[PDB]
Write a protein that binds this DNA or RNA. Structure first.
Ligand code: ZN
Lengths: 244, 49, 233, 1342, 55
RNA sequence: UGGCGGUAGCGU
DNA sequence: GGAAGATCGAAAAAAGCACGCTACCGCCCGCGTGGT
DNA sequence: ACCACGCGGGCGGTAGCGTGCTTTTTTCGATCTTCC
């Protein structure tokens, strides 16, 4: 389908063409030439050569570089054929199926919070506001402060005091998942109770650093927000720092 | 995102997944060497039927 | 001890990249000043370690990925296999030093069959009991070394393993629950310490260092002219 | 010594015991000189464009009548300078104009004499020029070409460790590597034969190439193997015998000469037997008949009676063959001497295996292997073999390649031909055979003598040669096709291929890297970098352990400390301080020659190969007077090892202790007390420092800061000495001295300091004036300090009060606690400049234009914009504001009466023009500081561009007016003196204007003649200045070249003042790094007895673990320096007399233990002492050399000089409680750096944003506002926990379920936490992909 | 498509492959294909046809 | 506001 | 007692080479045409 | 002279381009070795 091979505009009057479209165009042109020459009563040698070219074009489309010389585009690199972007590290299996980008996520450096409890983690107020935006909108609609989603959008943008109170109330005991980039074992991702802090750095419990293999040398940590009752109970019971 | 097209090839072409992925499926089925299949597919030698 | 020794004492011998030991060691303290030659000599080990870590992280990650794949579909799906066959577990001793004792090796595991008291033909533990700390202490009090314990490799359950044949959860006092993804946990546990490892490529008689009796296994021998025994096995 | 003017302001105390003999050379000399060799005219054709032109030109077509020759080349004057190219975005380059002569011979004349000649100059593209700072300006961007470490051309011998066949037998190989041509390889096999491989293709027997070289079988046998002659004597066929040939073989027969049995049959030969045989001088001996049969026959023998070959070459003989030869009448035969211990029959075995028989068969086989599928013919095979190695056009061995080839073969001729010869191949094969036998040793690939450095010049020359040969073949075809009479050189050649190749090399090459601009040290390190990566080099993954290691030959050439950590470990290195490149390309180091036990001051540059032969003493060797060594035994490096040697065996000594380390590593004080890993990471990290608001000099330094600051182009350096006539924050005008006057010029020079210009890393570049009005200056002095530079000294950080102690866990594990006073004083506040670009192009419907009027926007949004449509300069802007208003036509247009009539009617033509105004990105705030407008020719210019042009013209007019004012003042003084020489007219002249002075005339004499001559000179000078101003105005108003389609570009610069905050990355110079944890109040930090609180608190727990003791020593030294500065400030506060200040400063400077530096304050004129004390009021800088720094005794003495404890630890009180601390803590002053890793820059948080259009997944990256990626190990960790609902929510609801996303959003808005699984879109994409691959895949419902 | 008559021993195949304008030899397998003389003879004379292919 | 390639860097 | 199954090492083809993140650059057919 | 597209495909050449891994799997000259 064309949507699986989109023609993204380049914002300069040109269209970026994917490798699949170019390979399909090559195959179509070769097939049309073969049909035209067959209708022309061409000699046996020419027909055989055209059939061989059609076979090679189909070969390049199905799996480029499998046999002979890999077909190269304007970049002087082999084209990403149909099977090229299925297998490998960049294939659909290992890039869009096993692991995928998710919403309601943030990332920042980690500092040491000595006052934090074992089940608590310091979260910046900006992250709490941005990540819990749908929850803030729902609470604002329930309280009657705003009548529509747009009014809640303006209220959140303007940073009203009622917005801050709503943010404090709605994330009072909503667990969040903290994860480090080299997640070796299951302890690399753990649930924590957010505590509103100022600044721009996530505060981490000193005790959990050993299990996290976490370094206050500038390491970066990511935070995700469970957003259903099942996930909230699951993080509270199975993945909280007090349960490990 | 769902509708798919089709192209009517002038002449049949084999699938390389069953031809070059060792062991060759056509060669195993027909009990012929892989190079014979490669030669006949790439228009090198006539094959009796 | 090594780091403080390097700080206040001599740095000791250093090794060239080929692995050979340099005749002249570094006799300068970190508190004192190291000349250019000593620093140039010492840089070799640091460079080797950094390169080893850099080129070993990827290998460890690949091994962890393969291990987590090979056991991704293994979960607990039963409570008891009923099999009376298990692995024969004894403490491991290498040379003149005991590597791992029985108590730590069989902690949090279930016996495949009832272990009897040595020499009395009296049962010491039940057939299907889980060996916790008290059971291990009782077993070691009676000087027991050989125990038949149920193992995952002998789990008779198909399309998964049974809770009993696995053992303790190793993270909670109770036994393993039903439905836990033991395969992923095991693979991650094996693959995590891969970084701690290293990728670096580098007697005519027996001695006794303790007091005790001597026992022989798989032996046929003969007495020599002087009377000393010589083994023919 | 006489201190320089900039040095007299603030002299840094030096603690170096060793006296320096050689000054630090220019750091960038590796680059600039190289580029000179690429552009300087060369009388002989071996370097630069001249060599390429001589290699390519001349040309002869298929018809000999036509010819084209090259005369000379000239580099044109660049249109714009560095600054104009940088601002305008054009590439800094110069035209390349070459003189070409087209000669048409007389076709009718058989001898082909000249008939017509046409000489003309032709332009063949723009060659990019490289700035005086060692950088390139490509497409308006600053790029740097790094050197490449590559295997040198020549013959290299290698031997694998026997793992190939897995029995311990090693397979030797010899590789011939030309600069340009076909790599050749000779390899051994387990069967002990020789195989030749060309370009890593199929192996062939090595004798094939010898046969193809017109060598017969017998010639090869004689050349590769010695022969033993067996002659038919009266009986037993006595042979000439050499005793040494009998070593190591069992006596198969009794040996006897002159009737004396030396040994009998069946007994092993002994060395005593060999010596006895040599003493006997035996030349003839008896031979059993069976002994000859074991040997093989070398020369084929034929008999005239039989007419057939009884024997041939190279096969095993036998008894029947021996009898046939004996009866044939032949009496003399020659056999091979085969001894398995030392002379293996590898050549004979290879020849037996070889199926070729003559030259034609070998050539046919070589052609078939070279080009499979082509018909083997005699002429084609001959041509291919001749061109493979014996053609200068195809095979080219460089001069360094020839030198290495001759050195490895032990030939005494360094110079030689650039092509291979038969003798060279024969010698290579013989050397390989000798290596296999045991004689000699294999070469080391990691040896620095086998690795060459290719600079920018060599790669540029290679790319130029490629373009030149392309244009050469193109011009060959054009000349052959075209009509000779009417062909002109300009249209004859095409500059497209050469220009394209040059542009691609300069812009898109792997080694053409974006130059960093964090600090001058980073730029210096980047310029002086050697990378094995690149074309014809090692790959990141396929590197191996061995190459990344530090070879012993790296001493003095490549520092072992400064190298990137991670994937690029051991592959990227930095040049040493004294390292330099030889003419061949090998690195060399300076050394001091030691003769007769004394160390002379003369220096010699020894390369890597020559270093091994001699023995060199270490730099840290004590020397008494006359240069004798105090110790009987000195440590030395003789052959890749360190050992003790006697005093009189030394031949060379290291120049300085900084030779081993690089410039970046040498900047770290107390390096000898730092661990190798910590020092490595500190040296790497120093390049990431960001300049602060105010540059603060390092209290503890290494003395190399001045060299780094001066060598870098960040600071302004006075080209000529003089006095500062005019000093200003914008420009500095200096009147040069009478001694240094260039003839025929005004005598003033103007420096325009760059101000608040964005760097490559979005960092502000600020140049601040240093000198004052009337202050004399001299050549080489610093006039204005660049970024992170103080008084001509590089300063990447600030001196802060540091106390080592845990503080309530806020310093847990390398965390840093920062007092509020740091934020209050803006010590580490930084400025960041960001670029925002708006493009107005020509669309199909209609061209877009910038206008103030924008649809459906409030007046508040348009308030920031001007009438033209661009935000005012200096206006504070935030996220969502409109910096520039742009509207694009849509739907319909070209209806102006309706537009005028309906400008505000309810239709408002909203669909006709849609808003496309550039807006500030969300989360970005700052102040607009610069606006640039670029407009293509033929398009009406807006008023803002007119104002920018008027400002530029005003600046140029001001400079030209200053110059003209100086010149006219001089000329009018001259004319006044001339008039006074005649009619004085003093009273009226004082009352008369100078142009009325020109108006006045004198009587007819020589005075009137010179008066009118001076008037003519005056008007000529005025006209010349008018022409110069007109040219400058024309250059300013010249239109800018834009991309096809865009007609205007607007660039806006936003300045952001970033202050320190928790989460920012801070660190020192010893590799200790951390993140700010809490901005503690000033009243909470611990304070001393005097009540002064500390600024930074560091955790001591990190000191013993990393073994970086140097930071503690630096802290103690900084404490001592700050105590000295405190004493100076105290004596300055009492208004004490200059005598006491002089005495105290002299006492402070004279402290030490036989330091090389001596300071005499008696020659400071009693006035510069006050300035020095004012500069030293903050503190006294101390220069601590790298490996020759101050000891503990000197530090303790310096501390005792001030009123400070000798132990370096004081008593502190807790700020909050006020109670005494149980133990004294270590306080002092430490140099802290702010890294380029800001916490606010790492901020990223997304709840619901844009999604990819192919996989329906959230985007990635902070700029694109995308969520974080849940990796595979994250899924595995969730599975280990037993997480199922959370995993499903992560995989479907949050990422791919398009319906699920909307349902969940509407549920959360409604307050219900209900989840719908749906089905991921990526699974459907995969299903469609597999279906399109001809493979059925469907979901089975039942 | 272009038919070429020449002797390989006079002009080598590599030279023809390097001729300007010619892309590559029509080769089946390693060796270039040889056109039989009958095909050339039949294509030289009566191969052209007045039938219009583009409709 | 889409990706590909190259380069450099951060964290292990 | 010269051929057919075994094999044996030697050569050749194929697949994989940790994860997150940040910034910059360049590039997003390509040249040979046809009407004006 | 620029502006726009339209059929093709490695490139420019009257040839040749590559050139520092390891492990697994497949095939084949060539023996070999056992014997039909
Ligand atoms: Zn079981």
């Amino acid at each position: 389908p064309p949507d699986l091979r989109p023609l993204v505009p380049l914002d300069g009057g040109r269209f970026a063409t994917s490798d699949l479209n170019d390979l399909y165009r090559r195959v179509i042109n070769r097939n049309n030439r073969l049909k035209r020459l067959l209708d022309l009563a061409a000699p046996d040698i020419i027909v055989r050569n055209e059939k061989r070219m059609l076979q090679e074009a189909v070969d390049a489309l199905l799996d480029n570089g499998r046999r002979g010389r890999a077909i190269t585009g304007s970049n002087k690199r082999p084209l990403k054929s149909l099977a090229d972007m299925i297998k490998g590290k960049q294939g659909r299996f290992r890039q869009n199926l096993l692991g995928k980008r998710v919403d309601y996520s943030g990332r920042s450096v980690i500092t040491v919070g000595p006052y934090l409890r074992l089940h608590q983690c310091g979260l910046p107020k900006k992250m709490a506001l941005e990540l819990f935006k749908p929850f803030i909108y729902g609470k604002l609609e329930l309280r009657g402060l705003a009548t529509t989603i747009k009014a809640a959008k303006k209220m959140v943008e303007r940073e009203e005091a009622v917005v801050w109170d709503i943010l404090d109330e709605v994330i009072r005991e909503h667990p969040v998942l903290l994860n480090r980039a080299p997640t070796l074992h299951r302890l690399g991702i753990q649930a924590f109770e957010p505590v509103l802090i100022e600044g721009k750095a996530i505060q981490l419990h000193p005790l959990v650093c050993a299990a996290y293999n976490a370094d206050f040398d500038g390491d970066q940590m990511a935070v995700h927000v469970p957003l259903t009752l099942e996930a909230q109970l699951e993080a509270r019971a199975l993945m909280m720092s007090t349960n490990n | 995102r769902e509708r798919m097209g089709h192209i009517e090839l002038a002449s049949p072409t084999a699938h390389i997944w069953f031809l070059k992925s060792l062991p060759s499926r056509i060669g195993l089925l027909l009990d012929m060497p892989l190079r014979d299949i490669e030669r006949v597919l790439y228009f090198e030698s006539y094959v009796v039927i | 001890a090594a780091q403080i020794r390097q700080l206040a004492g001599m740095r000791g011998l250093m090794a060239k990249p080929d692995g050979s030991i340099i005749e002249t060691p570094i006799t300068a303290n970190f508190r004192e000043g190291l000349n250019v030659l000593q620093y140039f000599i010492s840089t070799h080990g640091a460079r080797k370690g950094l390169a080893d870590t850099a080129l070993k992280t990827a290998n460890s990650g690949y091994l962890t990925r393969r291990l987590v794949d090979v056991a991704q579909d293994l979960v607990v799906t039963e409570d008891d296999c009923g099999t009376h066959e298990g692995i024969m577990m004894t403490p491991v001793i290498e040379g003149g030093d005991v590597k791992e004792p029985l108590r730590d090796r069989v902690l949090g595991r279930v016996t495949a069959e009832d272990v009897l008291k040595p020499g009395t033909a009296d049962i010491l533990v039940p057939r299907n009991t889980l060996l916790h700390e008290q059971w291990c202490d009782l077993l070691e009090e009676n000087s027991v070394d050989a125990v038949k314990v149920r193992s995952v490799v002998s789990c008779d359950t198909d399309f998964g393993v049974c809770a009993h044949c696995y053992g303790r959860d190793l993270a909670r006092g109770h036994i393993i629950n039903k439905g836990e993804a033991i395969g992923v946990i095991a693979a991650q546990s094996i693959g995590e310490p891969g970084t701690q490892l290293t990728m670096r490529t580098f007697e005519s008689s027996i001695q006794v260092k303790n007091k005790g009796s001597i026992k022989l296994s798989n032996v046929k021998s003969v007495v020599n002219s002087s009377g000393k025994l010589v083994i023919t096995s | 010594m006489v201190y320089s003017y900039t040095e007299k302001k603030r002299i840094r105390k030096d603690f170096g015991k060793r006296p320096q003999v050689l000054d630090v050379p220019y750091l960038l000399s590796i680059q600039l000189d190289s580029f000179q060799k690429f552009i300087e005219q060369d009388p002989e054709g071996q370097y630069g464009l001249e060599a390429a032109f001589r290699s390519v030109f001349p040309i002869q077509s298929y018809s000999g009548n036509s010819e084209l020759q090259y005369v000379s080349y000239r580099l044109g004057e660049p249109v714009f300078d560095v600054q104009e190219c940088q601002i305008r975005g054009v590439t800094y380059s110069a035209p390349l104009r070459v003189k070409l002569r087209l000669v048409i011979y007389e076709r009718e004349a058989p001898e082909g004499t000249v008939k017509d000649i046409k000489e003309q100059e032709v332009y063949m593209g723009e060659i990019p020029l490289m700035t005086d700072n060692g950088t390139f300006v490509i497409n308006g961007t600053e790029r740097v070409i790094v050197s490449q470490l590559h295997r040198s051309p020549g013959v290299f011998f290698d031997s694998d460790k026997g793992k190939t066949h897995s029995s311990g037998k090693v397979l030797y190989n010899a590789r011939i590597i030309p600069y340009r041509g076909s790599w050749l390889d000779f390899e051994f096999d387990p069967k002990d034969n020789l195989f030749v491989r060309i370009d890593r293709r199929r192996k062939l027997p090595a004798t094939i190439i010898l046969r193809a070289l017109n060598y017969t079988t017998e010639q090869i046998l004689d050349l590769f193997f010695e022969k033993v002659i067996f002659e038919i004597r009266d009986n037993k066929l006595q042979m000439e015998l050499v005793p040494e040939r009998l070593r190591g073989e069992t006596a198969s027969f009794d040996i006897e000469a002159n009737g004396k049995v030396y040994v009998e049959k069946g007994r092993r030969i002994t060395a005593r037997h060999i010596r006895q045989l040599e003493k006997d001088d035996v030349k003839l001996i008896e031979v059993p008949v069976e002994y000859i049969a074991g040997k093989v026959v070398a020369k084929d023998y034929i008999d005239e009676s039989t007419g057939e070959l009884i024997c041939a070459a190279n096969m095993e003989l036998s008894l029947d063959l021996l009898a046939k030869l004996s009866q044939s009448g032949h009496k003399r035969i020659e056999t091979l001497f085969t001894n398995d211990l030392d002379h293996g029959p590898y050549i004979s075995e290879t020849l037996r295996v070889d199926p070729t028989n003559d030259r034609l068969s070998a050539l046919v086989e070589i052609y078939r292997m070279m080009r499979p599928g082509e018909p083997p013919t005699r002429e084609a095979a001959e041509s291919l073999f001749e061109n493979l190695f014996f053609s200068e056009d195809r095979y080219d061995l460089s001069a360094v390649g020839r030198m290495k080839f001759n050195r490895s073969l032990l030939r005494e001729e360094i110079e030689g031909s650039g092509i291979l010869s038969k003798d060279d191949i024969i010698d290579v094969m013989k050397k390989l055979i000798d290596i296999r036998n045991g004689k000699g040793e294999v070469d080391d690939i990691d040896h620095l003598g086998n690795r060459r450095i290719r600079s920018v010049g060599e790669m540029a020359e290679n790319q130029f040669r490629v373009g030149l040969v392309r244009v050469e073949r193109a011009v060959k075809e054009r000349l052959s096709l075209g009509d000779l009479d009417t062909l002109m050189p300009q249209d004859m050649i095409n500059a497209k291929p050469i220009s394209a190749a040059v542009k691609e090399f300069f812009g898109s090459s792997q080694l053409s890297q974006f130059m960093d601009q964090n600090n001058p040290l980073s730029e210096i390190t980047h310029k002086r970098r050697i990378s094995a990566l690149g074309p014809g080099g090692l790959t990141r993954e396929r590197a191996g352990f061995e190459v990344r290691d530090v070879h012993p030959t790296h001493y003095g050439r490549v520092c072992p400390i400064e190298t990137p950590e991670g994937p690029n470990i051991g592959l990227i290195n930095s040049l040493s301080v004294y390292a330099q490149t030889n003419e061949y390309g090998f690195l060399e180091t300076p050394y001091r020659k030691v003769t007769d036990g004394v160390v002379t001051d003369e220096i010699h540059y020894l390369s890597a190969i020559e270093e091994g032969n001699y023995v060199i003493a270490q730099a840290n060797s004590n020397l008494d007077e006359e240069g004798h060594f105090v110790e009987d035994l000195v440590t030395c490096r003789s052959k890749g090892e360190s050992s003790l040697f006697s005093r009189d065996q030394v031949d060379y000594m290291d120049v300085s202790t900084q030779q081993v380390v690089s410039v970046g590593a040498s900047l770290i004080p107390f390096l000898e007390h730092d661990d190798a890993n910590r020092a490595l990471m500190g040296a790497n990290m120093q390049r990431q420092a960001v300049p602060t608001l105010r540059a603060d000099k390092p209290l503890v330094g290494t003395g190399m800061e001045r060299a780094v600051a001066v060598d870098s182009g960040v600071t302004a350096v006075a080209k000529r000495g003089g006095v500062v006539q005019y000093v200003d924050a914008s420009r500095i005008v200096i009147k040069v001295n009478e001694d240094e006057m260039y003839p025929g010029e005004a005598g003033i020079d103007i420096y325009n300091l760059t101000k608040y210009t964005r760097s490559n890393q979005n960092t502000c570049i600020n140049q601040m004036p240093c000198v004052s009005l009337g202050e004399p200056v001299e050549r080489g002095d610093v006039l204005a300090d660049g970024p992170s530079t103080d008084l001509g000294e590089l300063a990447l950080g600030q001196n802060m009060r540091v106390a080592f102690m845990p503080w309530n866990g806020y310093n847990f594990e390398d965390s840093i606690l920062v007092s509020e006073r740091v934020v209050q004083e803006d010590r580490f506040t930084t400025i960041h400049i960001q670029e925002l670009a708006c493009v107005s192009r020509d669309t199909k419907l209609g061209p877009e234009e910038i206008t103030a009027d924008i649809p459906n926007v409030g007046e508040a949004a348009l308030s920031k914009l001007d009438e033209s449509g661009i935000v005012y300069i200096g206006a504070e802007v935030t996220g969502g504001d409109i910096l520039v208003g742009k509207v694009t036509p849509k739907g319909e247009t070209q209806l102006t009466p309706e537009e005028k009539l309906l400008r505000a009617i309810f239709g408002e033509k909203a669909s006709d023009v849609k808003d496309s105004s550039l807006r500030v990105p969300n989360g970005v705030s700052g102040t607009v500081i610069d606006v640039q407008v670029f407009t293509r020719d033929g398009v009406e210019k807006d008023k803002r561009a007119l104002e920018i042009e008027e400002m530029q013209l005003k600046q140029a007019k001001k400079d030209l007016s200053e110059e003209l004012q100086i010149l006219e003042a001089g000329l009018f003084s001259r004319i006044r003196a001339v008039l006074v020489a005649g009619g004085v007219e003093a009273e009226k002249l004082d009352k008369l204007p100078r142009d009325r002075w020109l108006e006045l005339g004198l009587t007819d004499e020589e005075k009137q003649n010179q008066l009118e001559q001076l008037a003519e000179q005056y008007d000529e000078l005025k006209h010349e200045f008018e022409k110069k101003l007109e040219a400058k105005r024309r250059k300013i108003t010249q239109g800018d070249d834009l991309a096809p389609g865009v007609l205007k570009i607007v660039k806006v610069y936003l300045a952001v003042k970033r202050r320190i905050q928790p989460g920012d990355k801070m660190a020192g110079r010893h590799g200790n790094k951390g993140v700010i944890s809490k901005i503690n109040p000033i009243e909470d930090m611990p304070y001393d007895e005097n009540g002064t609180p500390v600024d930074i608190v560091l955790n001591p727990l990190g000191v013993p673990s990393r073994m970086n003791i140097g930071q503690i020593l630096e802290t103690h030294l900084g404490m001592a320096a700050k105590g000295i500065g405190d004493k100076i400030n105290a004596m300055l506060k009492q208004q004490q007399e200059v005598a006491k200040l002089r005495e105290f400063i002299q006492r402070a400077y004279d402290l030490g233990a036989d330091v090389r530096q001596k300071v005499d304050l008696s020659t400071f004129s009693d006035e510069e002492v006050m300035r020095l004390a004012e500069n030293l009021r903050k503190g006294m800088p101390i220069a601590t050399p790298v490996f020759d720094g101050a000891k503990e005794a000197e530090i303790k003495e310096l501390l005792k000089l001030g009123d400070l404890p000798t132990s370096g630890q004081i008593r502190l009180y807790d700020g909050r409680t006020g109670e005494q601390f149980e133990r004294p803590v270590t306080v002092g002053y430490m140099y802290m750096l702010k890294l380029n890793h800001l916490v606010d820059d790492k901020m990223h948080a997304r709840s619901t944003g844009s999604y990819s259009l192919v996989t329906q997944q959230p985007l990635g990256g902070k700029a694109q506002f995308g969520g974080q990626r849940f990796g595979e190990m994250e899924v595995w960790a969730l599975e280990a926990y037993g997480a199922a609902y959370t995993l499903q929510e992560m995989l479907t609801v949050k990422s791919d379920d398009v319906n699920g996303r909307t349902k969940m959003y509407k549920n959360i808005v409604d307050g219900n936490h209900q989840m719908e699984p749906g089905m991921p879109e990526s699974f459907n994409v995969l299903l469609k992909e597999i279906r399109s691959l001809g493979i059925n895949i469907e979901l089975e419902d039942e | 498509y272009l038919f070429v008559e020449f002797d390989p021993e006079v002009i080598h195949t590599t030279t023809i492959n390097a001729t300007r304008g010619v892309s590559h030899f029509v080769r089946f397998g390693a060796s270039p294909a040889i056109v039989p003389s009958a095909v050339i003879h039949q294509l030289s004379v009566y191969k052209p046809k007045d039938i219009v292919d583009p409709a």
